[PDB]
Amino acid sequence: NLYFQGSQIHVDTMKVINDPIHGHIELHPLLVRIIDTPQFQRLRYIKQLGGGYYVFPGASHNRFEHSLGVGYLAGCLVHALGEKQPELQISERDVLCVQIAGLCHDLGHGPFSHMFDGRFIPLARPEVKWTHEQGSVMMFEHLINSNGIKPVMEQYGLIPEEDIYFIKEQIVGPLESLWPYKGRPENKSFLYEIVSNKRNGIDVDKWDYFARDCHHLGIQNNFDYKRFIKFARVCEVDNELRICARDKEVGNLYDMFHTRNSLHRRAYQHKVGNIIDTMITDAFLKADDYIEITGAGGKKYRISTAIDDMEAYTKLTDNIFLEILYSTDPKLKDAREILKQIEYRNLFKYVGETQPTGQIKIKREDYESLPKEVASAKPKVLLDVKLKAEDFIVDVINMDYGMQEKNPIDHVSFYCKTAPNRAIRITKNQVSQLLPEKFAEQLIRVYCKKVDRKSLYAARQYFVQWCADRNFTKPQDGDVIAPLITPQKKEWN
Amino acid sequence: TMKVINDPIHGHIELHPLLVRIIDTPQFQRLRYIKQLGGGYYVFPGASHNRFEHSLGVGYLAGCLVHALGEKQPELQISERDVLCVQIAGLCHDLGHGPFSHMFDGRFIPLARPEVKWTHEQGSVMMFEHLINSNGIKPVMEQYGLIPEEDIYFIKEQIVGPLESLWPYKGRPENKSFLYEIVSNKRNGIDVDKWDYFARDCHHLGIQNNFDYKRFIKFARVCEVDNELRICARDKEVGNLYDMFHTRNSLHRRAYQHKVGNIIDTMITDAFLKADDYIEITGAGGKKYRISTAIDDMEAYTKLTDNIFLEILYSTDPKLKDAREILKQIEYRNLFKYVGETQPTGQIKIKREDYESLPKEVASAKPKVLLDVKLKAEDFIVDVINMDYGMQEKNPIDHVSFYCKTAPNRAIRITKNQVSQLLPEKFAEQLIRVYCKKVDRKSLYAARQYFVQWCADRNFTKPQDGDVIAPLITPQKKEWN
Amino acid sequence: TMKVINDPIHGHIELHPLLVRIIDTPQFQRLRYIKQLGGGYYVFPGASHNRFEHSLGVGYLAGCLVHALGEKQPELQISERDVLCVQIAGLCHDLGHGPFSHMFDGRFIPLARPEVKWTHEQGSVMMFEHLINSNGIKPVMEQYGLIPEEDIYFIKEQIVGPLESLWPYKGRPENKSFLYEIVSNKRNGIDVDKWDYFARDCHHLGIQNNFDYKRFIKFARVCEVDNELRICARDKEVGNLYDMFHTRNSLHRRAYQHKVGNIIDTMITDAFLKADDYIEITGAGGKKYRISTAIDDMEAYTKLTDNIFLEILYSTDPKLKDAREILKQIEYRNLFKYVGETQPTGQIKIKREDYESLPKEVASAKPKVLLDVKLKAEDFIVDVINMDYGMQEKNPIDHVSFYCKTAPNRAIRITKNQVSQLLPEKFAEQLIRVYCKKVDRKSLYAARQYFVQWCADRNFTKPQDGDVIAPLITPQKKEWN
Amino acid sequence: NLYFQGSQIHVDTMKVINDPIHGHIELHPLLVRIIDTPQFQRLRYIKQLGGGYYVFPGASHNRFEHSLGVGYLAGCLVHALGEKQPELQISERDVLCVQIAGLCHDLGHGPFSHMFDGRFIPLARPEVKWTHEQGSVMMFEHLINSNGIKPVMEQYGLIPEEDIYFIKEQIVGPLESLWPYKGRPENKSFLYEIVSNKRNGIDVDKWDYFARDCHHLGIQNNFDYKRFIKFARVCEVDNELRICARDKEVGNLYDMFHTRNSLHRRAYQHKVGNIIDTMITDAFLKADDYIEITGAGGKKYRISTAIDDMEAYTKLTDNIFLEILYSTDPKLKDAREILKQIEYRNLFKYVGETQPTGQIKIKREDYESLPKEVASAKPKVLLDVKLKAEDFIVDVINMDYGMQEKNPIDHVSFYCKTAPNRAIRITKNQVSQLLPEKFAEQLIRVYCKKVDRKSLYAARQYFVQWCADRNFTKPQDGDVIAPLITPQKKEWN
């Protein structure tokens, strides 16, 4: 009922939501429509850090609130770039598409997040190749079709067929195969670098989880994403318009990856968190034949097959842990008993950690053979117990800066104060001599399923002997846990 | 051996092995599956926190306070036994919470089983008893200098208050009265439970906490008050105590009684009610229980957590279709519609006995407006919320003792007029929210007319948006104009 | 070119080159040498912050609010010119502060020059004029689309209010009335200045802020109110606004009116008074000014900052010995002694005209106690503190307009009884603190007897520690018992 | 007036002070007595980060509140060690002595902190060797004697002559020269590791400034000192009782030094902060002949000589900046004009940064010769201006992990869960391959005093040419600031 320039003013109030990390954030009605579906709300029932909650009691947070944050930050970054550089022709349509990709990037996660596609599926169904990102595309497709989203998209200026395609590409990368994308052309290449940056890993997904995980874990975040946004520009690089950082911000970018690595070290790869994820996975494996999840057309699926039907998968969340824990079916007794050991805190025992020494890398193909090697070690120590291959767990962890052996900063372009449209490269030696010499490494953790004092003492001897035999690094506590073993290796002394 | 645990609120805290033994049981770990703020998570997306981590915090703060008092006043004879007993009471105070915490004993049980009188605190005593007996805790307690019979009793008293109908406690004598004021302070509500939840809820909600519990600890002393040794606050800290209760009230206002959070709790409760005949939970000796009867068997109750929401949501049983359909409406965000809020005006108080009659009153209002729809009693929800400073109409600060710089062993009282004229005139009030289950535009417009008419008829306060939502109704009331 | 600056409160903020030009002048940089909380730093060791960084924050928030309003409501026709003018007013609002901020115009100038009527805000207009003229700012303003004559006028109005004795402003018309509500809101005190200092003072003091300014910005709209376009808050945010003023009051209570902070400000003021005849500050055309007369010459005033404290402390001039000796007593922590606090009881208000007569009243009390010492009027300090919600006896929320979800262009009013019965009954009060300059044990004991007797005689409130400090006095008053 | 076991209870209320970093902290009356003196209160008038405030507007904090924090943390650490290990025989006397050393460690700082002994004194008085720590001992001596502290110390169980000596040793290191300390014996060696740890730099001083500087700067701290305290033990190492960290905390210790280095990089060595410190120092140098500060017995001192008299030095604080800025004396016109240029933000212009390339290290002896080298470069670029040696500033910054080329973690001892009284060593390769290869480096910043556009363009050419000539690293913006220079160096391409 008010008018301006002779035309009625239309007042379209967006929803506001209060997030502890980002504060009050506004959700466009199209985003709200996507959010308020069973496919999205599902993420309220999947813990971000999976078994991490059982080590860090503040880590109760779920994928839901992280996804809101990623959607929010994706819009923040696209907006800022467009405000500073109208010549990029960023449209509100582009903004919404990037926000939706941000919201939906995690739709394909399963129970306990990385445990599911990182540990359980590879063991339960070795023949398949599954990733949560592939799952996200499929779940996104299912969300769109089950909830009549396409007309709503059209109502807000989106072109569903192109834009749905574009959203999927942002999530999973090129869907085929030159310019490998179809959703947007090379002059909007920078749009693909926002949600999941496949080129250097600098994206808003990291920015949300650094801040959010830190807030819940009780560890302080030292990366400043807002500063980065302020100094970001888009410049021509090899015929694409790409996001570039201010040159003198290079030190902060090295620190960003250092932070990521510290979070993995301190929290995500915590030795006990990992063994809990291992134990939950074992329980799921023993339950997989007996739990039924109804999918499309009444068809029955298992925990390991629900990934083949998005209707079943919608109902596959951290709830499966409690379904198992609370079950009475005698067929679920073995699975149930593993979860009960978690509750009593009768966990597999951590024996130690070591690393390879040369340019030596342990191949994934050989992971399964490692417990046998440990059990075959011949420690010159008088022991009350003999241990078998099946008593040992050997967990191999690849730690890197996101691009295996490569330095991600070699794949970042920068600009200088005096010529802000000119993209440049900065090499490691131009920055600092105190930076990492290498960008990838492997940690090897060993655990024992026999938890009594005698078995644990024995396990430590087998383990350190195995490290000696393989020319691995001397465990930090080697001289204390295995004083009779460590002298034999003079490379260690 | 003791353990260190990293909590985002309190940082690195040490757990004595006896506490660890209590924590690592099914009865305690259960609290990982019950959200602190229940349906609040569906309004505040940061409120994913569970009772588990809150209970750790309460146990920690209880030890902090008891330790501090003991270090400053060795004459109190606080033993490590006393410290452990207070820590255990802190840990176990919430053991009796059910699915979605306050929703369960606040909304569901009163409706599902009107004949019983159930509180989570009573549940906590029973669950604590079950924890002790099922996990062989008594020998471990003995190993660390506790006297199980006395101390178990003491712990229970700390949780629920005097266990019988003069010094009414048996676990500890009057010279250690201050020990009963730590976990759940029945006299004035100043306790470590509040201190943890202010800080923790604020951290997750995205609202900032303004109360400083550490300051309070620093200024706390124990003084003689009528043959008891009681905790006293420094006199000039009285303003901070009034602010503490103000903070509690702001948290209820902003978050815990959020109009949408409450309607979600209402809807979940409706779903539980429609599921209650059909869900089975196996308890002791294979006996079957229902959601509403699991409170009678701690073995069944152990398996009753927020999981019940998802069991219902994921069910295929046709008998659960109605329950399931309510939860699906939550997911689609098809919620009951908020109509408005009002309060009583005089010294008028709405009695609990009359709550059930209110939707009928609203439906029976006769608004002089032409409407396309007629609404019935069953279309309206009327939610009555008692807001107070924890002791109904009473000022909790009248039940606090203080000490002065010049005579730190002498307990004194401070009255409201000795502090400030800007403090509340009264300490309790009622908020009345009205919602409509019919969500279409025409029903909602009608509901607003019935509501404002009802407010006029009852001499309630004029709704804030009254002139906008019901312009034809508000003129009739000249008390409003 | 614009600059980015990292502030601990607001993070990375952008400064338009015109703002940078204003900031990089002696008149602005001066604020780096004036502590926000004056003597508060001597009680709260984190309160080292200066007016400079607060002014940056206010400028930043002023732009944030104006931008947000403009983005949601293009029909307001907010220009980048308007934005810059509001930002500049935000930056420059505090230019007129003197040494130790509120101590200077609140304590020192009233005592050193009773004939004048000086406020820091008037000072800010004069210093702003001097900044513009001494640094050739007008051409730079023109370069960025400002119209200097009009806009300089507008900026001054934002700072100090209407410049003359119906729409009383000339810088902008009624359709941009909302622009005058941003920096210093004379109508209800809801402005960005408070928002910065709540957050900044809390960060430095070690007290937590509970008001959320960002939420407020999100819910703010501009609506027609009597031919003006004014800022309106969402109706259901009314509780947060009452909390905002409560927070302000708690900050005054806990920090800004701390009894020791105030006595330090008092002592510094005494030192300045004893130094005022002897310190020379060169102003325009080589003329000499004093601490008390530098307010008459902006060139001299530019060089008048907290540095004066150290000039006095480090001086060797025998004429400055008395001033210097007061500051040395601050360093040794030989401060005047706090005797107690009381308030008036009826609708009684102590008039400013009578403040100077109060120490004499205290000294003239006749306590029936045997004392070793007799005290004189000059031994007592009586500090009268007016605590209110910013508009003396008035409720600021009666001067706030709101909007409702269903009609967001329609301004409405909300009354106190529509909100809550737990809110303050009144909105202003007076605290009376009494101190003694004689610090020995016998004098302090005597001072307490005179004080409590005086409270009894005047029917003031019973001091909290009254029965402890003056057990022979308190029984006489049965209103107290 | 209350009694227990027949004896009157004495209630001794400590002062409580609210600090934004540590919260409410209790001050023993002896500490209060030390604090409330002109010598201590002086630290309220000296900014922690000196000229840093002119770049980071939150950095208004002074040495005073930092010193309170260090005193507090020193007591926290000593207390915790004593609570866990009564066998160490830590007395309340020991605790107070460590707290006092913590409070007083910074007493010798001058105007703008590190600017004074780092920049000004070396230039104003090259013949002397002055450090703030030496100053702290002298000021501490002066504080004790001027305020009658010794009797108060005795009253609280201290033995002044021994303990004053001990406090001084904690501050400055061994006062002479086997066990080189006299204040305490080898069995209390760990007490010397608390305030200023001369062996590996792990001390409470760092812990306070990380947290405090971060709070004021608007940068987030990622080191957790409370965690460290929880895991600290004292163990026998080579006949001393020394502080040891839990073995698995080694990663956190590497991160602690990384944090220190990031704070230097981001804040303390900020290129503009440093040039402001340089300009203030220049102003002090031009004022030094004309400012008089009265010391003991009425003797007159200068800014550069006040370090010889603690009575004069007591009155030498950041106030000297404003005395100069506000002066009217024509003799101070040159000094005053430099400070006025700071206020107008007419600063010397930053030209660029480079590093040495080989095992090459620039010696301190050659610092003064560097501007001349830059001016002597012969860039093949057509320029409107010729620049002289005196137009250039060359600032050489040594960045390291606190022990020059050494790895501080090689000087840390650890303990293991299974044998908590046994000290062990952990080597770099036992931890991670992603850690620094080197632990020290030099940054070279160049600035120009001529600020016009033409001089700055020229300065950039001279600078990059100089980098080429010396085989220094290619400046990050080299190709942008000096496109005609960078091609000549093929080591750069």
Ligand SMILES: Nc1ncnc2c1ncn2[C@H]1C[C@H](O)[C@@H](COP(=O)(O)OP(=O)(O)OP(=O)(O)O)O1
């Ligand atoms: N007073 C408050 N302070 C901080 N956050 C709040 C407050 N009240 C609610 N929130 C949170 C909860 C939500 O995440 C978000 C929005 O809540 P709110 O504004 O109450 O939305 P709503 O949908 O209930 O109101 P409406 O639909 O009437 O606008 O802010």
Ligand SMILES: Nc1ncnc2c1ncn2[C@H]1C[C@H](O)[C@@H](COP(=O)(O)OP(=O)(O)OP(=O)(O)O)O1
């Ligand atoms: N580097 C870290 N920084 C902060 N918190 C941590 C770190 N590592 C672990 N945590 C958290 C997780 C837990 O809540 C708590 C205890 O972890 P941790 O010290 O790893 O115990 P642990 O039981 O695995 O080791 P151990 O049994 O060998 O002492 O600290």
Ligand SMILES: Nc1ncnc2c1ncn2[C@H]1C[C@H](O)[C@@H](COP(=O)(O)OP(=O)(O)OP(=O)(O)O)O1
């Ligand atoms: N790495 C950092 N992280 C956080 N804050 C920083 C960092 N570096 C500098 N700051 C702060 C100091 C200032 O308040 C603000 C601007 O600093 P900076 O970006 O260094 O500007 P500058 O003026 O020195 O660089 P230039 O002129 O080359 O853009 O940011």
Ligand SMILES: [Mg+2]
């Ligand atoms: Mg809503």
Ligand SMILES: [Mg+2]
């Ligand atoms: Mg452990």
Ligand SMILES: [Mg+2]
């Ligand atoms: Mg710059």
Ligand SMILES: [Mg+2]
């Ligand atoms: Mg005091």
